[PDB]
Design a protein around this ligand. Structure first.
Ligand SMILES: N#Cc1ccc(OCCn2cnc(N)c3ncnc2-3)cc1
Length: 167
């Protein structure tokens, strides 16, 4: 039993809710919140900008030190950093950005990072400003992630489209 509330069960291990990931995190304080990161951990907009703003820029400060030490992530890769006031840990995962021409096949590699964590609160990778089709992202999630994932979708219209088209 866990404290995630109000989710639709899609499969044995994937759940989805019409919800704000920052509010979910503030409420649940999950062990892991996933960020929709880029390779430079520059949290300017989208989910990343929202998560970072909610940490009062502490996520960005920590991320800048990470990059200065380690260099950029790979597309499809991840790193574990602090979750600050939102979660124990933040798993920064880089999905391909279609607006940068990146290969959508890398979306599966991106979701594989979730399997290193037993339970996660997450957005749909490569959705929104990353340019991919969120219906496709949800399908790859369900077909790749085997651990327990709680997906938070910002927009009622999108949430209803995802549910009503889910096979
Ligand atoms: N009109 C409209 C509209 C406004 C924001 C919006 O956010 C999508 C990405 N996103 C950003 N910030 C958050 N805290 C999120 N939680 C889940 N997804 C999140 C989508 C549609």
């Amino acid at each position: 039993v866990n404290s995630f509330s109000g989710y639709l069960k899609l499969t044995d291990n994937v759940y989805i809710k019409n919800a704000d990931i920052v509010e979910e995190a503030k409420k649940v304080k999950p062990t892991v919140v996933v960020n929709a990161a880029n390779v430079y951990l520059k949290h300017g907009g989208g989910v990343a900008g929202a998560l970072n703003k909610a940490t009062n820029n502490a996520m960005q400060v920590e991320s800048d030190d990470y990059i200065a030490t380690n260099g950029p992530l790979k597309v499809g890769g991840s790193c574990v950093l602090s979750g600050h006031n939102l979660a124990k840990h933040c798993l920064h995962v880089v999905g391909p950005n279609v607006n940068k021409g990146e290969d959508i096949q890398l979306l599966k590699s991106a979701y594989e990072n979730f399997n290193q964590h037993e339970v996660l609160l997450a957005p749909l990778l490569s959705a929104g400003i990353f340019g991919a089709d969120p219906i496709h992202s949800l399908r790859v999630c369900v077909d790749t992630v085997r651990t327990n994932v709680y997906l938070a979708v910002f927009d009622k219209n999108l949430y209803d489209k995802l549910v009503s088209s889910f096979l």
